[PDB]
Design a protein around this ligand. Structure first.
Ligand SMILES: Nc1ccnc(-c2cccc(-c3cc(N)ccn3)c2)c1
Lengths: 358, 358
């Protein structure tokens, strides 16, 4: 018998890697009609493979909620399960790209059966040894597994763009001599747009997590509904690097710039509206879901509501500005990107002043 | 005040992603003298940046051992620190690639100073509010931080090859029609060498984690020496995806097959020998570093040593057979790969049989 905490922590460390695998082809597309069609299908494949893996992760979370502890043999079998799930993103992509060929669906079916067989072995082993079962066995989701998966997914998504910078955007000496007259600074400057995208992408996904971090500190017990929205929250957060990378790219006409800013704001709203939904959904059954410091009329109630609702409000103002002003919108988008971090920093005083004003 | 357990775990998720960033160029190198020189420098940079980032991570662990708890302001500041450290891999690569130009060294000095001031702010903020410091203040490394970083590193390292397969090696419908006569099976079969690389890489990297996980469950209190040896163990584990990719590559002459097996066996020995070194180092101060269940003469003592010493001992035989046999060497390596997982599965039975014989 062994404590299962770490074995699972590693388990979600792999899944977050696998779930977000298909985002990499999305962000690596190079910038028209054919590109748009290609970009759409890549995005569609990403969302599908994210949910499929998430269901497999969900089954694992439930499966190991029964097996309270772990031993040497189960750890080996657990690895075989994870080794089995790592094929879903590839197998699915083959299936969609090849709907006519029956081989594609067969591989997809084989993989799903393989995951089931390994899990069937895992549960069988546990029953054969009652001391490996949870005391209850000897709806709610485990909170740690939701936390650990979320932390991973954000870390990959936050740092996607830099990994591309560290690899493909390191100047090569020969080009420096030829196309930059031997000036290193010029070579770095030509890469400046790509560096701004990373700064914005990290700041957004860096703060979106901060709202998530403070939300789940006061959550007593997650629920299936909260987990499902959380999955939808993270699914869209994966598109943020794509959004920012598009915004910083050169625009031939002002209409091109406006359209991209509309696209970028849409994903930020979708990513953070569901975090607000989780708060509201918890409020419905707050008696059994949240700490008593965030109940209706509680001390932190007003603070938490604002903290989650800032991005939904900020994004709508940016989107509304695009529709109405049509000329200062780009400045507002950049201005808000610099203002939102300040609002998060001064949230305590800002809300207190507002309460006095009201 | 807030519990920092989740906040730190996120920082270790970011750092593990950052430390092993430079391994991606290493494994993307395509297969002669120039390539050897190009491959050597890439491996040299990867080893350096891993040590630099781990040095940054080591400071982070010590810093936040003084900041016991956290609140809203600290969480934002911690994010600032991560934003700064995510540039060390890129800035260092710029410095090395351009030793002559003084700009590169200036950026590296700037980035390092940036981390210093941000940490200076955090320590200053905590001292301003005594209640946010640890009770002791208001050498040993925190165990959880060592595990979280280690689990991340194995997760990225284990799945490195698959993320490349899901992205680069999905058959092209037009190519299948042209270069494979429209037979999907032919296209997938041409990909077979790449898949066998992933099978071994996951198992070898996967089973190394299982040995690592078993060790760190029985350790009371990590130590600086253990942390340093752990860092070296992870640094070489990053080379396993490279090793198995080379072995599976087509060989023009048998001597090439022999050379690749020597390198592949070497990396496994270096990766696993240091995990044995951690065990040996801990035993020196067993009274204050390990469970009594793994002391000299303990119930599990013999079992643990076999589990860690399996790969170091198994690897030498694969290398030894290379020099002596020279014709069954390649066969032995393949058989050994299918043999070690069985030995790990049946370790408890195998050790019992050996004890009875002795
Ligand atoms: N977060 C990760 C994990 C693993 N790999 C990457 C990555 C980064 C940059 C480029 C490529 C790439 C590799 C190719 N062989 C072909 C085309 N792009 C992969 C990112």
């Amino acid at each position: 018998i062994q404590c299962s905490q770490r074995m699972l922590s590693f388990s979600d460390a792999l899944l977050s890697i696998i779930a977000t695998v298909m985002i990499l082809p999305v962000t690596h597309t190079e910038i028209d009609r054919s590109v748009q069609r290609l970009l759409a299908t890549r995005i569609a494949v990403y969302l599908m493979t994210f949910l499929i893996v998430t269901v497999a992760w969900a089954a694992h979370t439930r499966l190991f909620q029964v097996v309270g502890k772990t031993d040497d043999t189960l750890a080996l079998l657990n690895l075989a399960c994870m080794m089995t799930i790592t094929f879903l993103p590839y197998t699915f992509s083959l299936m969609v790209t090849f709907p006519d060929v029956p081989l594609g669906i067969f591989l997809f079916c084989v993989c799903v059966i393989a995951i089931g067989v390994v899990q069937a072995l895992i549960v069988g082993y546990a029953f054969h040894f009652p001391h490996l079962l949870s005391p209850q066995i000897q709806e709610p989701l485990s909170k740690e597994r939701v936390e650990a998966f979320s932390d991973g997914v954000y870390a990959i998504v936050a740092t996607l763009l830099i990994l591309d910078i560290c690899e493909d955007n390191v100047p090569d000496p020969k080009d420096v001599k030829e196309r930059f007259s031997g000036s290193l600074v010029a070579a770095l400057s030509a890469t400046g747009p790509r560096f701004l995208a990373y700064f914005g992408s990290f700041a957004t996904v860096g703060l979106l997590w901060f709202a998530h971090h403070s939300l789940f500190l006061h959550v007593r017990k997650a629920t299936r509904a909260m987990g499902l929205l959380n999955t939808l929250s993270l699914a869209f957060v994966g598109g943020l690097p794509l959004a920012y990378q598009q915004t910083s790219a050169f625009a031939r006409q002002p209409r091109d710039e406006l359209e991209r800013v509309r696209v970028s704001c849409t994903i930020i709203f979708l990513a953070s509206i569901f975090q607000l939904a989780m708060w509201t959904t918890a409020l419905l059954h707050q008696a059994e879901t949240l700490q008593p410091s965030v109940w209706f009329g509680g001390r932190e109630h007003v603070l938490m509501f604002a903290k989650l609702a800032l991005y939904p409000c900020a994004s709508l103002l940016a989107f509304a500005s695009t529709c109405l002003l049509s000329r200062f919108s780009v400045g507002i988008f950049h201005l808000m990107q610099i203002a939102v971090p300040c609002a998060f920093l001064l949230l305590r005083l800002l809300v207190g002043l507002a309460l006095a004003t009201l």
